[PDB]
Amino acid sequence: FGRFTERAQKVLALAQEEALRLGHNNIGTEHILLGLVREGEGIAAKALQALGLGSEKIQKEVESLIGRGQEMSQTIHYTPRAKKVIELSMDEARKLGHSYVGTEHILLGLIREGEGVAARVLNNLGVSLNKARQQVLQLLGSNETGSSAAGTNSNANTPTLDSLARDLTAIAKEDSLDPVIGRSKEIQRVIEVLSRRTKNNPVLIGEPGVGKTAIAEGLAQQIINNEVPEILRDKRVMTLDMGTVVAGTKYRGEFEDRLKKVMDEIRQAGNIILFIDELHTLIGAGGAEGAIDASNILKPSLARGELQCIGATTLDEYRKYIEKDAALERRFQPIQVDQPSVDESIQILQGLRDRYEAHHRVSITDDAIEAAVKLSDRYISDRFLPDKAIDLIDEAGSKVRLRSFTTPPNLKELEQKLDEVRKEKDAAVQSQEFEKAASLRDTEQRLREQVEDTKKSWKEKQGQENSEVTVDDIAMVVSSWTAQTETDKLLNMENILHSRVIGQDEAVVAVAKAVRRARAGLKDPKRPIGSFIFLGPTGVGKTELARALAESIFGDEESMIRIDMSEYMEKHSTSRLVGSPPGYVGYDEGGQLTEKVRRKPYSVVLLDAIEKAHPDVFNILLQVLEDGRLTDSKGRTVDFRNTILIMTSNVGASELKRNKYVGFNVQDETQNHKDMKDKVMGELKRAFRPEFINRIDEIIVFHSLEKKHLTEIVSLMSDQLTKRLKEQDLSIELTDAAKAKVAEEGVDLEYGARPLRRAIQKHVEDRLSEELLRGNIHKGQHIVLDVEDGEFVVKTTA
Template sequence: GNVIIFIDELHTLVGAGAAEGSIDASNMLKPALARGEIQCIGATTLDDYRKHIEKDGALKRRFQPIYVQPPSMDETIHIIHGLRDRYEEHHGVEISDEAVVEAVKLSDRYITDRFMPDKAIDLIDETGSRAKLQAYSLPGELKALDQELKKVASEKEGAISLQNFEEAVKFREEEERLRKLLDESKREWKKTQEQNKPVITKEDIAFVVSKMTGIPLVKLEEEESTKLLRMEEFIHKRIVGQEEAISAVCRAIRRSRAGLKEAKKPIGSFIFLGPTGVGKTELARALAEFLFNSEDALIRVDMSEYQEKFTSSRLFGAPPGYVGYEEGGQLTEKVRRRPYSVVLFDEIEKAHPDIFNVLLQVLDDGVLTDSLGRKIDFKNTLVIMTSNLATKLIQKGVSLGFQRTEQADQNKRMKDEVLAELRRVFSPEFLNRIDEVVVFHQLEKEHLVSIIDILVKELNARLLERGIQLEVGDDVKHWLIKEGYQPMYGARPMRRTIERRIGDPLSEELIRGRFKDVRKIKVVLRDDSPLFVEEEALAEV
């Protein structure tokens, strides 16, 4: 009567031991539970309770269900303080108070698929294990001594096999000396390790979280307010022009990070409108690198692949009974594995309209349920959609966007025309959930000098393995602009022009072996065509 039985995973008793003509373990428990002969506490999950125990009404009636909610952050800190001594003893480390607080804070923010206090305790445990392995690995001097001992032992064996016993005696004496020295050094090292236990700090916790989630360490450690304030400066290194567009995006992200947005919604949701080749997709890549320190954090979905209604099952998973049901969706699986990311829906006007109805709950509640019934959390994602809807207006000769030479009312009129086109194509309930519609303008000639600088920098990065640096003069840049400027198509014709006019002839010269011992090449203009000149030859001229 004074004993309480605790059964973990209670649902496993249902059907356990059942065979022809016998009863299972749960039915054997029922009479004792009904008479109050035993006191029992069982633990199971909601899904397993519904699947196994609710089906057996008699067993369900004998237990009073109590729903256990995950503890708050403060409660989790108290729980870990109570467990800290055991983990310190187990790993042979000291866990600082700041590490406990950081573990709770970072696990709550970055580990989204598990619950407190389990994920915070696991984080402390894993960090302690890492600290122990690092601290108790042999230092370099002891490893070198051990290698030397093995070498001498091998030479001694070689001398014995050649019957060179005088040499063998010398090697044996040297071996004994080294073994004594190694044993003594190991004892001293172990004694020092026991006296100076490694201390786990918040930096150690941040490192383990970055390994678990794939979010770079800089993202966790850097003061976020400082980073957000220099957001425009970072993005302008990659995107030329588009000041209004970049400013609108940065404002929305800062508003979100300052805590002025709804907690359950995504970090931000944008539609990028504008002609082709002006930097819409590139801005999404730049945002992925800025927010999550890696372009790999960009999940790109090409909407031209979803032109039919039934293709939505590829995004969110096939329904039960259909091929691919167990595989999950292409979008939901990627976000589930990498919840901190930029989700880019490229060229949305090409997708079937019904697909956007499914995205309504992502934009509103930050949640999407996949075909397996799992709720995928989008609250830590940035949702970006790009569209070329405005290209038709460009083709009519209408100047788009925010050009410095135009007056403010002309600017506004152009933007209104683009937004009217957007409202014609997309439903009001979809547009009403977007944080901001960002309009990109055509690239002007003065922007192309900066674009050429960026493209030459990319070319130099590829030439780096050959130890060559390429320098392009201002006259060549203006000549390239004259050759490759096509306002209708943005920056892409300029990339092709550089590949054709500089990349192709340079690759031929490299294959011929002309620049084997050259470190710097300057591109100059001769007779309306580019010429590659070594730095030394240029000095002579």
Template sequence: MSFFNKFSKNAREILDASFEEANLLNHYYVGVEHIFLAILKIENGSVYDLFKNYGFNLESTRMEIIKKVGRGKVESYVDGYTPRAMKCLERSYKHSLLLGKKEVQVEDIAYSISYERESILEEIMESKINNFEEFRMNLSKNKKIKMNDVKENDSNYTNLNKYAIDITKYAADNRLDPVVGRDDEIKRIIQVLLRRTKKNPCIIGESGVGKTALVEGLAKKIVSGKVPKILKNKRILSLNISNVVAGSKYRGEFEKRLNGILEEVKLANNVILFIDEIHSIVGAGGAEGAVDASSILKPSLSRGELQIIGATTISEYKKYIERDSAFERRLQPILIDEPKINKAIEILFTLKERYENHHRVRFTKEAIVLAVNLSSRYINDRFLPDKAIDVLDEAAAKKRMEFNETNNKTIIYENKLREIRIEKGNAIKMYDFEKAAILRDEERNVIEKIEEFKLDEVVKEEKYIKVDANDIEKIISEWTAIPVSKLEEEETEKLKNLEILIKEKIIGQDDAIKSIASSIKRSRIGLSSPNRPIGSFIFLGPTGVGKTELSKVLTLILFGSLNSLIRVDMSEYMESHTISKLIGSPPGYQGHEEGGQLTEIIRLKPYSVILFDEIEKAHKDIFNILLQILDDGILTDAKGRKINFKNTVIIMTSNLGAEKFANKKFLGFMEDINSKGYENMKQIMFEELKLFFKPEFINRVDDIVVFKKLKINDIYKITNILLADLVERVEKLKIIMFITNEAKKYIGDIGFSDIYGARPLKRIIAKHLENKITEMILNELLSEGDILKVSLVNNELKFDVEVKNGEG
């Protein structure tokens, strides 16, 4: 906060000369020393006369100061005043006010400099002037005024001090983070502030893009003097409207507070109010019979008595500010975009030192670049650079926490030591000296361990930990549940054998398995398009051939749980209005706040398998929604949020054309799955698909897979898989179960249907096996430890029980 327009011509000449002094000494800043050097160069005036009267040798003093401060090694650009110099100039301004002066004179600056504590100037001046206090009083020209009186008159600014924060003071004290890559935007704000009318910029941008940082950057420029002359005496105060509203119980109390703030701003005549979340002032404090904050501000804004900088998001600007056209026209919108990837990386490199010092870590270059790239790709509901900074911050916190885990060991051993000492004391009281001696030795060992851990802690505290790319990947995975880390050896083996693992559960559908396994491998290696889902498939074929089962098996292999399978029964979306169930109801309709059934799940579980079952049953408007997902990997819900589908596997099942094969048997089809019968079925199903779906929908799908009709040998294999699952469940009841091959074949034969495929198998197993075993357990014919054998006798299943040893 500078006050240059309140300085006299002579005083301004001194300040200009101080820049020249800094430049001559190759210093990149202007300190109090440079200002004093400029004062010592003057050869007339009251200050010059006073120095002469006190026998002050100006030239020798100049040489002594230059010797003390030294010269820079290389020429440098003078950046601006130091915080200490700014405070000195502020004191001189306040001193002139106390004396009732209209302008700050050279003697006011000299008087302020004489109060520089613990500085080389104080040391030099006191050594060269005999009666230093008298010298000060003569500089002041008013012996009743002392520097202790030269303080900011807080009583004049009670409301501002209570409800506002001085951002320029924070900038002067170097308490703000550096602002990088936003020079053009800051220049645009300055440009608006310099206008004759509508000189109130409103920064509009999404959360996290750096709106507040722009204002902090402007404050830094004001403090360093890198702004046009008209802004050099300005202070930016951040006003929190919610604090002004809080506690205003009675009618008129809020208006009184806000009007008090406006009066103080007018009195100061150098304040720009920064109102973050400026949309909150529309309606703020506007109880029944009262006016809101925006209505109170409008007259002052119109007359130019008040200057504000606002910040809000795009949606809130439209929702609140645009609704109040009278308030909107007093603001000048400045749209701030999310920084590009390379700019965000530059921002993180600038900020990294502050986070490194806070966490006592060191970020590798790869970690910083990856934090931006991965957060940009996988965190879609937030914006750069904020989300990348948060990733970096948490990665450092996690690393430091892991590194200090030995603290827990120290605590454990200290507790153990306490217990040993209590036990040893009790042993001595009982005269059990043998036990006490053993405990004494144990006590010594524990003390040694504690000392070892404490020494280790000291070493670790002094050491900076490295945060690398792997740490960033772990944080992204924790946030999104998406495995973004490099392939571990175990996962590599799983991917290599993905087809084999699926074939263990899915029988007779090699083409479908190969297609979906290839998509998963491409995505996990990083070769697939990052702007589309991992894979999208349409599974065609008659019922009961494994279309839905393949989706379940894939989910289990990839995620280890069916919780990551999102099944959408498309028969529930047969009407056009049901589209709102997927993406959410429009504003004004019931359920708008709840979000869509599909979009909300994907927002919480972005790495999932989505199964659209029996897609042909859905209304045709639903396919327009799916087009957006398949093409861009993004779906906008009813609230305007962009939901990321880029880490999902999309599977759509359909029975189109299957009815033509329900009662038909193409020549040779059942004998050879690669024969003309299967090709005919495939061709007919493709034709049916083309008739039903639009070409643009079909072209966006990665692969269309026709499932083969199951043969009896396939049914036998599926039967074995299902029966193995039953045996496993029975063994959990601590009962051993055997099923003969003849019995398995019998189950397969009666469970096979040419029309329904393998679908009746589970029902047959439940009817002929599970129900019988349940009855036997309830009737105490079968219990823990028994052996159950299921065989086929006279074309019927026979259940034999071998009772456990030692009992009947």
């Protein structure tokens, strides 16, 4: 049961033998019984010889109940009873120690599943069924490692170590311990700081976020064996846990009483090491709130070395303890925690691939592992650098492991047939259709034997998916979050961003390429996907491209934040509402803006019209542009490494507002371009900061919307119109002639692709609706809005 021990399987195959050997077509419980005793001296077999039930004695009974004569042994797979005995044994292996499933369990499970032919064999052969289930148990009903009695004791150590609580050493003396790949430098640094007699308390500060316990298992082992100072004379290691204390209680006072009590029993001092997990909760005080002020008791305890302890703390906690003092300042002392370096990360994963062989889709592929880490590091980007990886391995190590049984080569169809029959078949007999059920059954069951036969032919689709964990695989899971469903996005990025925005194609390919750079690596993993400013008169393609980025990269059209900076400039938005100064940065930092971007990680953040925002707004954005972090609410650091920052503006508005033509000029546009790329891009610097523009990755210039782009934007919008009416069954079209007429509203010198929505609204929505109401056009007929006189005419078509 999961590659879980021979002894089970071994008793079982002898059943199949017995199946045909006396002639049983489904291998009954009588054959299972024989299987056990013919497996000779396994716990099942052995037991039966104890009960007095020899294989002979059993078989004599067996042949007299069924025995003869289904020697044809039709399919010979089990009887459902016999299938239960196996299902039972797995639980009987939980029941009688054995992770894996072997012989005791099968006889015990058999008794449990007493049933007909088995049951009658032993109760006829003068053996009580429970005397047998006993019998197997009392020979073996165990598997054991480490623990096993022999007697040892210590005295004063008793009251303390009893209480309360978990001991890492215990599980490591019984030893099921796995290292698990430390996180070494902490262990040394703890042991100087532990092996003191005043600040004999280590305090581990680090990413949590590595699994603190990896260091802990580190410590455990190293404090025992075998080079440790004489200060740490005859040490014992006990880990403390709040969780048992809080459970079974519901008032604070008892927890504190117990903490006082514990603090007393730790008096085995200079011979005891206490590990205090979740140290922060106990320390309390500080801030505007504590966390539980057990600290009062704990502080002298730490100083005394009775609670000579290791504190596992957090970012903030050290502040609220060295602030407390002086059995909390001359107690505590910090030391720096490790994690497995980005390449090392890859290796940790790899190490547990082979053990994901009960997950049977790892080990392999290397490239997938390497990828697991790397693709995640740059995009999603919602986690720290090592964790992401293994999860992908396993995810995809199931997505595709599913693709195994989704299609065989596509020989899933066999089973599909067996179904179609069954339906017909069954129901045919339920009406009957006696013999008219017959052939359906035969067609069904024809199918059935074939099905079970071809289900172990679908070991080929296992050899296909079931160790692979591919780059592609990994990529797919990263895409699940957000190779495979990332690189089509990468390779075609301009094309895909182009497919939603035609407004300044110049801009689209550039933006595309910047994302493709980050999203294909060689940029800081800390830094965002892209910082940008997109200039051009309002929504040239600008806003729309932010949308198109979301659409293309993430597979969701919108997963795109969007804030207008002109409302909290840090400049003029001091007193827009209020008569006194209170406001603008306080919203921006203090929670509002930052919380919103915190919700979607892979989010095109669009900060609108930053044109007359203060140089201060830019410093905040700058932290993203430099570090790729934002510092905000609840003391959280939000790692901007998956955001795509797009700030729009019309900062030197006038110069932007001179089209990128094409349909008017083709060379005044590239002279508006250079021109907007200086007066704009310098008003950009003048209202922002040059440092800002300097750590903005790219300053994209969009002019006024090309003369050119409009009927293509219109042909997406007018068609988006034609598509949203089709869902409830109305076919509308604006001809190319009518889509041309729609484009005319803005052709632009001072505006973007914004008036186009409105002109679709006027020329499509409004235009169809005044014709559907008047009965020119109807449901389930094609509505041609055409131009054939320089103005719209609503025509009807099939």
